[PDB]
Design a protein around this ligand. Structure first.
Ligand SMILES: COCCCOc1ccccc1N1CCN(C[C@H](N)[C@@H](O)C[C@H](C(=O)NCC(C)(C)C(N)=O)C(C)C)CC1=O
Ligand SMILES: *[C@@H]1O[C@H](CO)[C@@H](O)[C@H](O)[C@H]1NC(C)=O
Length: 340
C-alpha cells in the first residue's frame, strides 16, 4: 500500500434530503455524469448510448457513448447488478474516469437496461460503488482501489458529508473527501466500530432503542452503513415494532403520521458498539407541515436485504446527515463523528 500526500474532494448536490450525487467524467474527451457514491456496492456504472430508448429512464438520463471516446477500451462481457431496490444490466467497458481532480483508468458498467422503478426517479445518471472488491460483481476492481494504487492519497480512507438543508443554492450540497476527512464539517472526536467481516461496510449493532425502552435488536444485529441509501432501513419485522411505537400507518413504500404528531415522536437510538447515536423527531421526520389534516413521512422505511449480507439494518442519509462518516479501509472500521 503506497500512500502519497494528496487529498481529493467531490462536491455533492443535495436533492430533497433523499439524493446526494456528485459528478465524474468518463472518457476522452470527458462525458460528465451525475453519480451516487454508494458504499453499499462496488461497481461503477452509467446509462449507455446503446440503451434501447424503450427504457424511458435512458431517455431521461445522460448516456455514455464509447464511439466518442478515444480512450475507450472494449471488453463487453455481460453484467447485471441486483440492488435491494432495483436492477440494472449491460456490459463492461474501460475508460479514463475523472473524480475530484483524480484520473484513473476504470472499468465500468455500460447499462443498456434500466427499468423505470427506481431510476426514473433518479436525479442522477449512475452509481459509483464504494464497497470492497469482494462485493464487486464480475470481480471488477472497485474505483477507490485503483486510485489507492496510484499511491497518491494520504490515507487509505474516504469520508462522507451529507448536508441537512437541501435546496437553498447558496449552501454546499454535500462533500466526499478522498484520502481522509474534512474537519471543517464535524466536531468532537471520531468514534470507530470494526467491520464484522471485510469486503462489506457492515458493523455490529448492540441494540436499537425507541425512546426509553430498547425494544429492538435486543440480541444485537447488523448495521450496514449505506451511503447510497436515503433512509435508515431495517427488517420488515424490526420496522413493524418500531412503527407500532411511533403509531405510524404503514403505507405502500414508507410510513407516515399526521403532521401534528411529528414534534412528539420520541428519540430513536442506535447503540453502535461504544456510543449511543441518537436521532430526534426532526432527525427522521419530514416535517413538511404541522396539521392533523396532512400526512408527514418518516425517513426510516422497512427493507429486507438478502443473505449472505442480510437480514440487516442499513444506515443511510437519514443517519449520516447527523453523523459525519469516515470509511477506513486500512483498519477496516467506520468512524463516526458529529457532523456540523
Ligand atoms: C445518497 O443517495 C440516496 C440514495 C438514492 O436512491 C436512489 C434514488 C433513485 C434511483 C436509484 C437510487 N438508488 C441509489 C443506488 N442504490 C444502491 C444501494 N445503496 C445498494 O448499494 C444497496 C446494497 C446492495 O443491495 N448491494 C448490491 C449487491 C447485492 C450486488 C452487493 N454489492 O452486495 C444493500 C446490501 C444495502 C440503490 C438505489 O435505489
Ligand atoms: C474482460 O475482462 C476480463 C478480466 O481480465 C478478461 O479476462 C476478458 O478477456 C475481457 N473481455 C474481453 C476478451 O474483451
Amino acid at each position: 500500500l503506497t500512500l502519497g500526500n494528496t487529498t481529493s474532494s467531490v462536491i455533492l448536490t443535495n436533492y430533497m434530503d433523499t439524493q446526494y450525487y456528485g459528478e465524474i467524467g468518463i472518457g476522452t474527451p470527458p462525458q460528465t455524469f451525475k453519480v451516487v457514491f454508494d458504499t453499499g456496492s462496488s461497481n461503477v456504472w452509467v446509462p449507455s448510448s446503446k440503451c434501447s430508448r424503450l427504457y424511458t429512464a435512458c431517455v431521461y438520463h445522460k448516456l455514455f457513448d464509447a464511439s466518442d471516446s478515444s480512450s475507450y477500451k472494449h471488453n463487453g462481457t455481460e453484467l447485471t447488478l441486483r440492488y435491494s431496490t432495483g436492477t440494472v444490466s449491460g456490459f463492461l467497458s474501460q475508460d479514463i474516469i475523472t473524480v475530484g481532480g483524480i484520473t484513473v483508468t476504470q472499468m465500468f458498467g455500460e447499462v443498456t437496461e434500466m427499468p423505470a422503478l427506481p431510476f426514473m426517479l433518479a436525479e442522477f445518471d449512475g452509481v459509483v460503488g464504494m464497497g470492497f472488491i469482494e462485493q464487486a460483481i464480475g470481480r471488477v476492481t472497485p474505483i477507490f482501489d485503483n486510485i489507492i494504487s496510484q499511491g497518491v492519497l494520504k490515507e487509505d480512507v474516504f469520508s462522507f458529508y451529507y448536508n441537512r438543508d437541501s435546496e437553498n443554492s447558496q449552501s454546499l450540497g454535500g462533500q466526499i473527501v478522498l484520502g481522509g476527512s474534512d474537519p471543517q464539517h464535524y466536531e468532537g472526536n471520531f468514534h470507530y466500530i470494526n467491520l464484522i467481516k471485510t469486503g462489506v461496510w457492515q458493523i455490529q449493532m448492540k441494540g436499537v432503542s425507541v425512546g426509553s425502552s430498547t425494544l429492538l435488536c435486543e440480541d444485537g444485529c447488523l448495521a450496514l452503513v449505506d451511503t447510497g441509501a436515503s433512509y435508515i432501513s431495517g427488517s420488515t419485522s424490526s420496522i413493524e415494532k418500531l412503527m407500532e411505537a411511533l403509531g405510524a400507518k404503514k403505507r405502500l413504500f414508507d410510513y407516515v403520521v399526521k403532521c401534528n404528531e411529528g414534534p412528539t415522536l420520541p428519540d430513536i437510538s442506535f447503540h453502535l458498539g461504544g456510543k449511543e447515536y441518537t436521532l430526534t423527531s426532526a432527525d427522521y421526520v419530514f416535517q413538511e407541515s404541522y396539521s392533523s389534516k396532512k400526512l408527514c413521512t418518516l425517513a426510516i422505511h422497512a427493507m429486507d436485504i438478502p443473505p449472505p449480507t442480510g437480514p440487516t439494518w442499513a444506515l443511510g442519509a437519514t443517519f449520516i446527515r447527523k453523523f459525519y462518516t469516515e470509511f477506513d479501509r486500512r483498519n477496516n472500521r467506520i468512524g463516526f463523528a458529529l457532523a456540523r
